[PDB]
Protein backbone atom coordinates (compact mmCIF):
# COMPACT_ATOMS: atom_id res chain seq x y z
CA UNK A 1 0.00 0.00 0.00
CA UNK A 2 1.98 2.90 -1.45
CA UNK A 3 -0.55 5.70 -2.08
CA UNK A 4 -0.84 6.48 -5.75
CA UNK A 5 0.50 10.03 -5.33
CA UNK A 6 3.67 8.88 -3.48
CA UNK A 7 6.82 6.93 -4.29
CA UNK A 8 8.77 4.48 -2.17
CA UNK A 9 12.38 5.38 -1.47
CA UNK A 10 14.40 2.19 -0.78
CA UNK A 11 16.27 2.09 2.50
CA UNK A 12 20.01 2.51 2.44
CA UNK A 13 22.97 4.50 3.61
CA UNK A 14 23.92 7.54 1.57
CA UNK A 15 26.38 10.41 1.71
CA UNK A 16 24.42 13.52 2.63
CA UNK A 17 25.95 16.81 1.54
CA UNK A 18 28.53 17.92 -1.00
CA UNK A 19 32.15 16.81 -1.49
CA UNK A 20 34.97 19.36 -1.36
CA UNK A 21 35.54 19.00 -5.10
CA UNK A 22 32.04 20.36 -5.74
CA UNK A 23 32.77 23.46 -3.64
CA UNK A 24 36.07 23.91 -5.52
CA UNK A 25 34.06 23.66 -8.72
CA UNK A 26 31.65 26.32 -7.51
CA UNK A 27 34.55 28.63 -6.60
CA UNK A 28 35.79 28.44 -10.18
CA UNK A 29 32.38 28.84 -11.86
CA UNK A 30 31.09 32.22 -12.87
CA UNK A 31 28.74 32.65 -9.92
CA UNK A 32 28.60 35.23 -7.17
CA UNK A 33 28.50 33.55 -3.81
CA UNK A 34 31.59 32.81 -1.70
CA UNK A 35 32.57 29.34 -0.59
CA UNK A 36 31.28 29.88 2.93
CA UNK A 37 27.77 30.08 1.45
CA UNK A 38 28.14 26.39 0.54
CA UNK A 39 30.16 24.97 3.44
CA UNK A 40 26.92 24.28 5.28
CA UNK A 41 26.69 21.30 2.88
CA UNK A 42 29.96 19.92 4.33
CA UNK A 43 31.36 17.61 5.31
CA UNK A 44 29.43 14.80 3.72
CA UNK A 45 28.05 12.49 6.42
CA UNK A 46 26.82 8.86 6.24
CA UNK A 47 23.05 8.76 6.74
CA UNK A 48 21.08 5.56 7.14
CA UNK A 49 17.37 5.58 6.33
CA UNK A 50 14.76 2.82 6.13
CA UNK A 51 12.25 2.47 3.34
CA UNK A 52 10.06 5.56 3.38
CA UNK A 53 7.41 7.29 1.28
CA UNK A 54 7.53 10.72 -0.28
CA UNK A 55 5.10 12.68 -2.46
CA UNK A 56 5.73 12.57 -6.20
CA UNK A 57 4.69 16.23 -6.51
CA UNK A 58 4.63 19.38 -4.46
CA UNK A 59 1.25 20.01 -2.84
CA UNK A 60 -0.88 21.88 -5.37
CA UNK A 61 -3.26 24.80 -5.10
CA UNK A 62 -6.25 22.50 -5.73
CA UNK A 63 -5.09 20.14 -2.98
CA UNK A 64 -4.55 22.93 -0.43
CA UNK A 65 -7.94 24.43 -1.35
CA UNK A 66 -9.66 21.14 -0.53
CA UNK A 67 -7.94 21.14 2.87
CA UNK A 68 -9.08 24.71 3.57
CA UNK A 69 -12.61 23.98 2.28
CA UNK A 70 -13.01 20.97 4.56
CA UNK A 71 -11.39 22.47 7.69
CA UNK A 72 -11.73 26.25 7.53
CA UNK A 73 -7.97 26.53 8.11
CA UNK A 74 -6.65 30.08 8.07
CA UNK A 75 -3.00 30.43 7.02
CA UNK A 76 -0.34 32.45 8.83
CA UNK A 77 -0.26 34.96 5.96
CA UNK A 78 -3.99 35.61 6.14
CA UNK A 79 -3.74 36.13 9.93
CA UNK A 80 -0.86 38.55 9.43
CA UNK A 81 -2.57 40.47 6.61
CA UNK A 82 0.39 40.13 4.24
CA UNK A 83 3.20 37.96 2.97
CA UNK A 84 6.48 38.29 1.11
CA UNK A 85 6.92 38.80 -2.63
CA UNK A 86 10.16 39.52 -4.43
CA UNK A 87 10.18 43.03 -5.90
CA UNK A 88 12.69 44.64 -8.20
CA UNK A 89 15.57 44.40 -5.73
CA UNK A 90 14.45 42.86 -2.42
CA UNK A 91 11.81 40.78 -0.74
CA UNK A 92 8.93 42.99 0.28
CA UNK A 93 5.74 42.51 2.22
CA UNK A 94 2.65 42.64 0.03
CA UNK A 95 -0.68 43.27 1.71
CA UNK A 96 -3.22 40.51 1.18
CA UNK A 97 -0.68 38.11 -0.28
CA UNK A 98 -1.52 34.49 0.61
CA UNK A 99 -2.05 31.17 -1.18
CA UNK A 100 -5.18 32.43 -2.95
CA UNK A 101 -3.84 35.96 -3.64
CA UNK A 102 -0.30 35.10 -4.67
CA UNK A 103 0.65 38.65 -5.59
CA UNK A 104 -1.57 40.35 -3.00
CA UNK A 105 -4.92 42.06 -3.34
CA UNK A 106 -5.85 42.21 -7.01
CA UNK A 107 -4.49 38.73 -7.84
CA UNK A 108 -5.91 35.23 -7.76
CA UNK A 109 -5.07 31.65 -8.62
CA UNK A 110 -7.39 31.38 -11.59
CA UNK A 111 -6.45 28.47 -13.78
CA UNK A 112 -3.32 27.52 -11.84
CA UNK A 113 -4.76 24.96 -9.48
CA UNK A 114 -2.21 22.33 -10.66
CA UNK A 115 0.67 24.62 -9.68
CA UNK A 116 2.37 24.23 -6.28
CA UNK A 117 0.62 26.16 -3.50
CA UNK A 118 2.71 29.08 -2.10
CA UNK A 119 2.65 31.51 0.88
CA UNK A 120 2.77 28.41 3.08
CA UNK A 121 4.28 28.95 6.53
CA UNK A 122 5.96 26.12 8.40
CA UNK A 123 2.81 25.69 10.51
CA UNK A 124 0.53 25.70 7.44
CA UNK A 125 2.60 22.91 5.95
CA UNK A 126 2.45 20.85 9.14
CA UNK A 127 -1.31 21.43 9.49
CA UNK A 128 -1.96 20.20 5.94
CA UNK A 129 0.38 17.22 6.26
CA UNK A 130 -1.29 16.25 9.54
CA UNK A 131 -4.78 16.51 7.95
CA UNK A 132 -3.55 14.36 5.05
CA UNK A 133 -2.37 11.61 7.43
CA UNK A 134 1.23 12.40 6.59
CA UNK A 135 4.03 14.73 7.65
CA UNK A 136 6.78 16.80 6.18
CA UNK A 137 9.95 15.12 4.94
CA UNK A 138 13.06 15.46 6.98
CA UNK A 139 16.00 17.12 5.25
CA UNK A 140 17.66 13.72 4.90
CA UNK A 141 14.59 12.13 3.35
CA UNK A 142 14.32 15.08 0.95
CA UNK A 143 17.91 14.98 -0.24
CA UNK A 144 17.98 11.19 -0.61
CA UNK A 145 14.83 11.40 -2.75
CA UNK A 146 16.47 14.13 -4.84
CA UNK A 147 19.98 12.77 -5.45
CA UNK A 148 19.19 9.06 -5.48
CA UNK A 149 21.41 6.36 -3.96
CA UNK A 150 24.68 7.96 -5.18
CA UNK A 151 25.95 11.53 -5.20
CA UNK A 152 24.83 13.73 -8.11
CA UNK A 153 24.63 17.52 -8.52
CA UNK A 154 21.00 17.48 -9.77
CA UNK A 155 18.37 14.72 -9.71
CA UNK A 156 19.04 13.74 -13.32
CA UNK A 157 22.83 13.68 -12.98
CA UNK A 158 25.87 15.93 -13.19
CA UNK A 159 25.26 17.69 -16.53
CA UNK A 160 23.14 20.84 -16.43
CA UNK A 161 20.22 21.10 -18.85
CA UNK A 162 17.98 24.16 -18.59
CA UNK A 163 15.11 22.22 -20.16
CA UNK A 164 14.82 19.83 -17.20
CA UNK A 165 13.23 22.13 -14.61
CA UNK A 166 11.59 25.49 -13.91
CA UNK A 167 14.52 27.79 -13.13
CA UNK A 168 15.84 31.16 -14.24
CA UNK A 169 18.36 29.34 -16.45
CA UNK A 170 15.56 28.71 -18.95
CA UNK A 171 14.39 32.34 -18.93
CA UNK A 172 17.87 33.77 -19.20
CA UNK A 173 18.72 31.39 -22.00
CA UNK A 174 15.50 32.22 -23.84
CA UNK A 175 16.33 35.95 -23.75
CA UNK A 176 19.80 35.29 -25.16
CA UNK A 177 22.03 36.51 -22.36
CA UNK A 178 22.08 37.51 -18.71
CA UNK A 179 22.03 41.22 -19.57
CA UNK A 180 18.75 40.83 -21.48
CA UNK A 181 17.50 38.78 -18.53
CA UNK A 182 18.41 41.67 -16.23
CA UNK A 183 16.57 44.12 -18.50
CA UNK A 184 13.56 41.78 -18.58
CA UNK A 185 13.56 41.60 -14.79
CA UNK A 186 13.24 45.38 -14.66
CA UNK A 187 10.51 45.56 -17.29
CA UNK A 188 8.27 42.94 -15.67
CA UNK A 189 8.38 44.82 -12.35
CA UNK A 190 7.51 48.11 -13.99
CA UNK A 191 4.68 46.41 -15.92
CA UNK A 192 3.79 45.20 -12.41
CA UNK A 193 2.01 42.50 -14.42
CA UNK A 194 2.59 38.89 -13.37
CA UNK A 195 4.21 37.66 -10.18
CA UNK A 196 4.81 33.98 -9.19
CA UNK A 197 6.26 32.13 -12.21
CA UNK A 198 5.46 28.60 -11.10
CA UNK A 199 4.82 25.66 -13.44
CA UNK A 200 2.34 22.80 -13.04
CA UNK A 201 3.53 19.95 -10.85
CA UNK A 202 5.19 17.25 -12.92
CA UNK A 203 5.44 19.44 -16.02
CA UNK A 204 9.08 18.36 -16.60
CA UNK A 205 8.59 14.66 -15.97
CA UNK A 206 10.25 12.36 -16.77
CA UNK A 207 13.45 14.11 -17.81
CA UNK A 208 13.91 16.19 -14.64
CA UNK A 209 12.71 13.56 -12.17
CA UNK A 210 14.87 11.87 -9.57
CA UNK A 211 15.85 8.23 -9.96
CA UNK A 212 13.02 7.16 -7.60
CA UNK A 213 10.40 9.22 -9.43
CA UNK A 214 10.05 12.56 -7.62
CA UNK A 215 9.21 15.54 -9.80
CA UNK A 216 10.30 19.19 -9.38
CA UNK A 217 13.03 18.50 -6.80
CA UNK A 218 14.83 21.21 -8.80
CA UNK A 219 13.32 24.68 -8.99
CA UNK A 220 9.66 25.72 -9.22
CA UNK A 221 9.11 26.46 -5.50
CA UNK A 222 11.19 26.21 -2.35
CA UNK A 223 10.06 23.39 -0.03
CA UNK A 224 9.82 23.16 3.75
CA UNK A 225 11.30 20.18 5.58
CA UNK A 226 10.82 19.32 9.25
CA UNK A 227 14.55 19.55 10.01
CA UNK A 228 15.88 22.17 12.40
CA UNK A 229 18.93 23.91 10.97
CA UNK A 230 22.15 22.18 12.03
CA UNK A 231 25.75 21.86 10.86
CA UNK A 232 26.94 18.47 9.58
CA UNK A 233 30.11 18.81 11.71
CA UNK A 234 30.65 21.01 14.80
CA UNK A 235 33.72 22.40 13.02
CA UNK A 236 31.98 23.51 9.81
CA UNK A 237 32.29 27.27 9.21
CA UNK A 238 29.83 29.25 7.07
CA UNK A 239 28.75 32.82 6.57
CA UNK A 240 27.79 34.25 10.00
CA UNK A 241 24.23 34.83 8.79
CA UNK A 242 23.97 31.06 8.38
CA UNK A 243 25.29 30.30 11.86
CA UNK A 244 22.80 32.84 13.22
CA UNK A 245 19.82 30.65 12.27
CA UNK A 246 21.24 27.33 13.43
CA UNK A 247 18.97 25.64 15.94
CA UNK A 248 16.21 28.13 15.01
CA UNK A 249 15.20 28.03 11.37
CA UNK A 250 13.84 24.95 9.58
CA UNK A 251 15.59 23.74 6.45
CA UNK A 252 14.15 24.70 3.04
CA UNK A 253 15.15 22.68 -0.04
CA UNK A 254 15.11 22.56 -3.81
CA UNK A 255 15.49 26.21 -4.81
CA UNK A 256 12.82 28.06 -6.80
CA UNK A 257 11.94 29.37 -10.25
CA UNK A 258 14.03 32.44 -9.39
CA UNK A 259 17.32 30.54 -8.95
CA UNK A 260 20.06 29.54 -11.37
CA UNK A 261 21.61 26.07 -11.52
CA UNK A 262 23.91 26.36 -8.50
CA UNK A 263 21.17 27.08 -5.97
CA UNK A 264 18.95 24.19 -7.18
CA UNK A 265 21.40 21.32 -6.54
CA UNK A 266 20.13 18.31 -4.56
CA UNK A 267 22.38 19.17 -1.64
CA UNK A 268 21.69 22.91 -1.54
CA UNK A 269 20.55 24.00 1.90
CA UNK A 270 18.45 27.04 2.73
CA UNK A 271 16.74 28.11 5.99
CA UNK A 272 13.40 29.68 6.85
CA UNK A 273 11.84 31.29 9.90
CA UNK A 274 9.23 28.75 11.06
CA UNK A 275 7.22 31.21 13.15
CA UNK A 276 4.69 32.32 10.49
CA UNK A 277 6.82 33.83 7.72
CA UNK A 278 6.10 32.81 4.12
CA UNK A 279 6.67 33.98 0.55
CA UNK A 280 5.21 33.68 -2.97
CA UNK A 281 7.78 31.01 -3.96
CA UNK A 282 7.66 28.70 -0.91
CA UNK A 283 5.58 25.50 -0.79
CA UNK A 284 6.09 21.92 0.35
CA UNK A 285 5.45 18.26 -0.21
CA UNK A 286 4.60 15.48 2.23
CA UNK A 287 6.21 12.24 3.27
CA UNK A 288 5.13 9.29 5.38
CA UNK A 289 6.50 6.26 7.15
CA UNK A 290 5.82 3.08 5.20
CA UNK A 291 3.55 1.92 8.02
CA UNK A 292 1.78 4.71 9.88
Amino acid sequence: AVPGDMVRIPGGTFLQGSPERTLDWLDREGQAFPRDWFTDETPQIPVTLPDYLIDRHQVTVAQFAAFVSRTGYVTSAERAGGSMVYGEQYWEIREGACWHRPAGYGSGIRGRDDHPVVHISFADAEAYARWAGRRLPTESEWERAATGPSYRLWPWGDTWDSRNANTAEHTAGALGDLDAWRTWWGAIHAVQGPMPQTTPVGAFSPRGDSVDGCADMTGNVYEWTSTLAHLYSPATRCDPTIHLVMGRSRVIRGGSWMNFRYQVRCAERLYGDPTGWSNFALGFRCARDVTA
Partner: peptide, 8 residues
Protein backbone atom coordinates in the same frame (compact mmCIF):
# COMPACT_ATOMS: atom_id res chain seq x y z
CA UNK B 1 11.08 40.79 13.10
CA UNK B 2 11.71 37.72 10.89
CA UNK B 3 14.92 36.11 9.62
CA UNK B 4 13.08 35.35 6.37
CA UNK B 5 15.13 33.29 3.93
CA UNK B 6 18.74 32.63 4.95
CA UNK B 7 21.25 33.09 3.41
CA UNK B 8 19.71 36.09 1.66
Amino acid sequence: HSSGLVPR
